[PDB]
Assembly symmetry: D3
Homo-oligomer: 221 residues x 6
């Protein structure tokens, strides 16, 4: 019940559904989510994944009341992020994993890693400056403040800002455009994009992971 | 005829001229254009090159009708700035032509699109590398997978073009920018741009190689 | 006096104070500025640094009056404390490179950005050819570098060069508000995260920074060679 | 008849067989060779490829009397090079593609690209300094002189130098060691090695290809 | 007991001490060893660290028997040179321990091997990156796929170890090298090594990330 | 006189000629050597350059007698013509870096290699921390750098640092034979290929070279800071 799995015209929709916890990523939810992603990639009759949250929050990150390794699988099928509300810390990283982002007017983005005293391990310190710019990323990370939907459109984090009631329709519309194209070309091309992006981000992703472990180790002392 | 060549105040203007074929890059036009670029680079009496198309289309890409009866990169190393005056639609191969330019200035009528996935080809002129680097990851992947048009204003918002002007002011604006460059220290200008090109390829080389191998691999199947 | 140094609520403000010379970085000012940054990094009572200029100019670059073709090495030290650049006016050439060094930029409505290296006959050595396209985009950086024309505050905003454009008298207060909410954070996590950001950036810009320096060295060598004949 | 295809205990042996042309790589031989490689990778009951030449020459390179693009496919199965004799220019590049090299006492290595007035396009200028050292590679490439089997062992180009009659037995012995191991681990590990090597060589491979095209273009002038 | 710790003339000697388990890295031994390294790095009265094993085995790798009843990298950033005195077999995980050292000196009895493919695991301590970088591509891939032993002299020939000495001269030789380092300007020594480490990771970071992802991906299946 | 310049069969030989000072690179010698290389690159009648030293030493490095902590920028120019290093004797520190700059090394039986940077209290600026491990291996380079001990000609041979070790009186003749068979090649293809080799190497060493320079700048800064107190 914590993850809603929908299939509609070769589009797989994943909805984070723990709204009483701001859709926080518990161990059970993380397990089911990444398994769902792998299930979609293996599924021959699925072409596009849409990622969204149950209103009013997208994902507030990992469950803090409950409590690490990167688990997003290698995919040839596009994941569209439909950000219905606040994407915070761990949830911001989920959004950064996506190929295409689409925001509601009510979407907000924040990185509170430094506030809660933990260092990122899901590529934020690489992908955030990559997709919003260096200056803004450092401002977001160091302050912990919210970025607005309009500011996210101006910075390039999202491709479009739509009225709340048209978030999911807009996402299926883009998804339909992808399903209409040559699938083999689409997947080979996306695979190329991923491969190229991987070549550019790999060194940074390793440096992030080192900084995180060293911070944890230094903390234990 | 298919390529018009003008010289004025140390500025070399190259105009794609197959309006009945939407300035599509035929074998003939390619050989002229790339020979024309080498001509300008070798000419000390030339400091700035302006690339544009005959109205209303900039370049519809490669002539895929000619290929139906029958593509490594050929853009030569240059120390002279190439200004793209995008007068209309720059699609697929024509988009890559635009991506090659150092500076892009758009008409109100200018629009951009990648239809590689519609026609079952993978790019070989740096699109999967230059497009994300110039319009952002999210927007680039949305353009490549849907095949939809990006407008002039959205190209301005995303950083693809440096300016959007009234249609009859397109080339006057381009020649004005050119005049500023022609106004500066040419040794410094050429040494600086050479450094820019040097630094850029130090960052895109690996990606360009991966794009090429993906294309070859895809052609093979 | 040519450099104003203020401390308030764990925030160190550095003000370039040669207004009669448009805050041009003379030899004496470069020595004191880079010394000031090192102090801030070494001072345990400092968490955030604010860099700004005395009105109406932020910084017009190197003092070209007081200097064969001048070769100037980069001196900006490694830091774990964030540096906020409050761009109050014109940031030109060398001053533009000072701004690109900053972690966070906040622009006045009067802020302007320009690169006149090609116009005076020198190649950059403080990271411009690497950082400028990194932060404003490739097309915009090359247009700026080759023309020498000014980039406005609002154009800089949509390009990503600055995070915010505020009314002129709100510039410093905005810079201090951002500083305060950084100061209000976990300082171990802040400095560990910024150190990480710097490391990742360094691993991405190193090759470029070297190629810039070589191109500069190679350009000065020709210039002297030509001049001596 | 120009390529000998052998299958023995899950080991696929490819023998270049145009000894009257020093096993030169004609168009027909290149077509059959790379198809053979792809056939071996797709073959489920094949674990290892052994590459060798018909005595007394390994491969003298491309057929010059007859007359370009890299065609070596992505593989998860190990290719062992059994160098029976002279590996020259194009043939040296074939040897450099292999995962493991084993030399006869009669094996020799030479790069005559500069002598015949053509620039390499199969990774020599990247892989040769990678596997024999920078100083030796530049000496080989600039002079065109032969490298001895013993000097190749001292430089790291080959892993072992055996008596001529034990070249192929030694190769099948190593091949048998690989067939004896966990295949899934072996292939995943080799795939990792290839991926890592690709990240380090991609930028160079693209720069080589550019230098080659620019040399061809400059030649036409 | 499982890890002996000696201090002599500003040299810190770390001796793996589970000879009944062939110095296999159990959970206990790992925690001691990596804590011991952090101790040495923090101690200003220490300039050089010597890593060695209790005869006749250096380190048989991780204790896979302990794991049978139940592995991210943990080697900390150091400005002090770590000398590996390989006294015997350095296998798999123990090989990676050796690969971490700045300087390797081998006994006549020292031998090296990678059995990751025999036991169905993929490396996580940098083997697929450091092994090829230190013994060459061809030799590294032959070692990883066959699981065979590389001898001391062949390790000397390939560049893995800087020297091979008589067995009773192993540690005297190591302390002699250490004494030369202890003899130099320590600020310069530590600044230089820090630069070496910096430059090295600038070249291996991407590869280390790829190794980690390959391991995780392989574990997943 | 401190630099001997010979031309024979399209081969330019450069001989470091300060034997009484172990061919130490003084300010005057550095100026003339790097000027000589540029001439060779510019001379259409030259195809190959040979660098060697007057016996018994190849080069003992920078003249430390004639010089706060000295900062020396890299000056080795971009070249499309191969440079053969005929290592006749000791190549120490700075002289070691001269050798690593060469495309091809040929060692005398008397050739020795050492790095004494750590011993005299300076960090390298001519590419040692990047090129030395690139050409002799990581373990061997670090052992060399941290100890300052000598590497012998034959040990250098098996490590890959030199392509060949010959009898002393055969050194130059060997270097000329290699040169002659380069000269006997297609000179367009030779220079296009070497230019390509250099470009690929540059794209692999740039980041490292920048990190070396920063580490050196950062080390000198501390050294002066400590000394001034």
């Amino acid at each position: 019940d914590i993850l809603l799995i929908d299939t509609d015209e070769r589009v797989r929709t994943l909805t984070l559904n723990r709204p009483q916890s701001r859709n926080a990523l518990s161990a059970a939810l993380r397990d089911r989510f990444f398994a769902a992603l792998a299930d979609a990639e293996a599924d021959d009759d699925i072409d596009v994944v849409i990622l969204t949250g149950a209103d009013p929050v997208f994902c507030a990150g990992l469950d803090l009341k409950e409590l690490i390794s990167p688990r997003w699988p290698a995919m040839t099928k596009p994941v569209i992020g439909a950000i219905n509300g606040a994407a915070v810390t761990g949830g911001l990283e989920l959004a950064l994993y996506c190929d295409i982002l689409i925001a509601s007017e009510h979407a907000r983005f924040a990185d509170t890693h430094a506030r809660v005293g933990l260092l990122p391990t899901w590529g934020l310190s690489v992908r955030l400056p990559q997709k919003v710019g260096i200056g803004l990323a450092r401002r977001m990370s160091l302050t912990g403040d919210y970025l607005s939907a309009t500011d996210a459109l101006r910075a390039g984090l999202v491709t479009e800002v739509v009225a709340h009631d048209q978030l999911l329709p807009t996402a299926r519309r883009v998804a339909a455009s992808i399903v209409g194209n040559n699938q083999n070309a689409v997947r080979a091309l996306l695979a190329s994009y991923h491969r190229i992006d991987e070549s550019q981000t790999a060194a940074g992703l390793w440096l992030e992971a080192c900084a995180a472990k060293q911070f944890r180790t230094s903390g234990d002392t």
